[PDB]
Amino acid sequence: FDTIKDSKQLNGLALAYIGDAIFEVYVRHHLLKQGFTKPNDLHKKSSRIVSAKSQAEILFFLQNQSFFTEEEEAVLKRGRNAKNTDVQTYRYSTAFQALLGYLFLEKKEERLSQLVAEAIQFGTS
Amino acid sequence: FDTIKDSKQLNGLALAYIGDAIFEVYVRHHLLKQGFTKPNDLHKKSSRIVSAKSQAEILFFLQNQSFFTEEEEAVLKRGRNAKNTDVQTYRYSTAFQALLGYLFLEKKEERLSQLVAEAIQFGTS
């Protein structure tokens, strides 16, 4: 993908907007790779993993592992504050989505794969 | 992403399932790159481009350019026949989604970028 000029200046919602799609590709790819193959199977599986509640729970989990660097912490803060979903779950899921968006747009490919794998480990289990 | 064993044997719906997410990342990235930045802006933009009607129209367009190779034609046939949306628009959009899924999973990265850019040229305009 092309570099986007000043992508790191993007507001939290704009970062969360790309992050949410990125997470969906990783999760759907994961489920295919596990040998699921049926439609109603795969959509039930991915909607469960990609839901706001589940992304909130994932982020909490990763915070207790002290997974993140200070740069990533700053991007999560940006997403959490970006101006039938709970307020706190909205804030945390948007934080997680903004970080994925950020890592993707900044082309931190290795770190993004690491983070999503961790997220998927927890969110599937 | 890891290779998925016998990914090319996947049924049309399973290929369309990953293709649809892939298309969403490309389209969202495109809109960010164009310097859109507002939420209600970007979602209105991408839902318009990624809708079944618009993917049907895109595929028709590309067919008249005789864009596709014979291998890709076979994958479109698989998606079109995979067992408030119109029947024909469903069939064509699923065909387009299965091809993107296929190109992605088979790691035909250059061809996938080519196809999506063409799709986005037409679908935005």
The domain locations on chain B are: 1-125
C-alpha closest to that of B73 among B103, B108, B105, B113? B103
Answer for the pair B90, B109: CB distance below 8 angstroms, yes or no. Answer: no
CB pair distance less than 8 Å for B10 and A32: yes
C-alpha closest to that of A80 among A99, A57, A63, A107? A99
Helix (H) / strand (E) containing A119 = helix A109-124
Q: Indicate the DSSP class of residue B5.
A: T
Identity of the residue numbered A61: F
CB pair distance less than 8 Å for B37 and A4: no
Cα–Cα distance for residue pair A45/B104, rounded to 1 Å: 21
Chain B residue closest in CA terms to A14: B37
Is A90 at the interface with chain B, CB within 8 A? no
Q: Which residue is associated with the tokens 């909205």?
A: A90
Identity of the residue numbered B13: L
Indicate the residue of A21, A33, A39 with minimum beta-carbon distance to B28.
A21
Indicate the residue of B18, B32, B42 with minimum beta-carbon distance to A29.
B18
Cα–Cα distance for residue pair B45/B29, rounded to 1 Å: 12
Residues just before a chain gap in chain A (C–N exceeding 2.5 Å) are: 83
The CATH homologous superfamily of the domain defined by B1-125: Ribonuclease III domain (1.10.1520.10)
Answer for the pair B66, B82: CB distance below 8 angstroms, yes or no. Answer: no
Six-digit token string for B18: 């990953």
CB pair distance less than 8 Å for A25 and B29: no
Cα–Cα distance for residue pair A100/A54, rounded to 1 Å: 15
- Angle B118-A107-A121 from CA coordinates, rounded to 5°: 105
- Angle B2-B5-B6 from CA coordinates, rounded to 5°: 135
Cα dihedral sign, A42-A45-A49-A52: positive
- A40: burial class by Cβ within 10 Å (0-12, 13-18, 19+)? exposed
| Min Cα–Cα distance to chain B from A103, Å | 13
Is B25 at the interface with chain A, CB within 8 A? yes
Torsion angles phi and psi, residue A87, rounded to 5 = -55, -45
Is B4 at the interface with chain A, CB within 8 A? yes
> Known catalytic residue: A20?
yes
Is A105 at the interface with chain B, CB within 8 A? yes
Is B9 at the interface with chain A, CB within 8 A? no
The DSSP result for B22-55, as a single string, is HHHHHHHHHHHHTT---HHHHHHHHHHHHSHHHH
- Count other Cβ atoms within 10 Å, centred on residue A4: 18
Cα–Cα distance for residue pair A11/A48, rounded to 1 Å: 27
Sequence-distant (6+) residues with CB within 8 A of B54 are B48, B123
Answer for the pair B76, B68: CB distance below 8 angstroms, yes or no. Answer: yes
The DSSP result for A43-109, as a single string, is HHHHHHHHSHHHHHHHHHHHHHTT---HHHHHHHHHHHT-----HHHHHHHHHHHHHHHHHHHTT-H
Six-digit token string for B102: 């296929």
Active site residues of B: 20
